[PDB]
Amino acid sequence: SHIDCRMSPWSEWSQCDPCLRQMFRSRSIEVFGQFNGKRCTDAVGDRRQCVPTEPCEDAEDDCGNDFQCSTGRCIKMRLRC
């Protein structure tokens, strides 16, 4: 039996993420295909650039404790030289 893949349930566009600058057109997987028919490896997910509307005031501070590293981590007490 040449079972096809019913694998295109589309969803509605969600709100744009201002800080990440991405959209969330959604999808889902329903049918694989048990027999030698059409193989369907279509991955779930879709992205899109979007003009941000929020100021994106949320940000990660440099732990407010000690010397900041070049990547984002911090010295606790003795991570010096």
């Binding site: 600058r21 057109r25 059409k38 369907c40 279509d42 991955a43 992205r47 899109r48």
Partner: protein
């Protein structure tokens, strides 16, 4: 060991590999998705005799 070859291959669609925040990345993403769907469902043993 000098020259190996593939045995098992885990698969992933190409339209997920397109770089984000490009000129028209999202529309090109869904466009290539429709293209690969039309490719995989266009010509095969299913359509032949």
């Amino acid at each position: 060991n000098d020259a190996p070859v593939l045995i098992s291959q885990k698969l992933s669609p190409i339209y997920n590999l397109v770089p984000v925040k490009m000129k028209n990345a999202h529309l090109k993403k869904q466009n290539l998705e429709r293209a690969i769907e039309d490719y995989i469902n266009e010509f095969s043993v299913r359509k032949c005799h």
